[PDB]
Amino acid sequence: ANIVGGIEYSINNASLCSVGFSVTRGATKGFVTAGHCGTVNATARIGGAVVGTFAARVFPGNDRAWVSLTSAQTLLPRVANGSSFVTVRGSTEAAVGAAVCRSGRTTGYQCGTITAKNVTANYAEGAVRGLTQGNACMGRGDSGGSWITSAGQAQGVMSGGNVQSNGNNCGIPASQRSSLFERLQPILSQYGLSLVTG
């Protein structure tokens, strides 16, 4: 499978989530995603074929994970934008007020701005601390998907937010959306991962 930020992947032939970012760990290929997507060893599939299993995750508390993939996957320094792509250039954290976009299998590519840092999400499972808040919309399915600036700076992966009865926060005004993402920095250090860039 070609590994691109934003594309769909299923877990144990059940849940769906989105690919975050292609990364490496020595000779091991992987992608970073949201922890809530799977438990250690769940099987990840792309378009019906096995690609890898979850190597590690933390959820709740934090919301992060990395899937290690078989050698046959092709890692790419790109994030899906319709039929186009955003090249991953690095991971400089943008500040409050920066514009940002996110890519996911449910709502496609959405942009907005970062409105707050260090927010706690009270999920049914337990609190999730230190998330950054953006106002780009998202829907069930987007989780684990990429948050990136137009300039190609990777920000994090989609955790959650205030989904309305229609499964997203797209029908409510930007000012009322709270779309939360887990910062990429600490996921990269925690697991010793390197981002694939172009």
């Binding site: 989530c17 949201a34 809530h36 959820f59 919301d63 999400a121 009270n122 999920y123 049914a124 499972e125 999730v128 998202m138 829907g139 069930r140 399915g141 987007d142 989780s143 989609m158 955790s159 959650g160 937010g161 205030n162 989904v163 709270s178 939360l180």
Partner: peptide
Amino acid sequence: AAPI
């Protein structure tokens, strides 16, 4: 808020 909910995860996703």
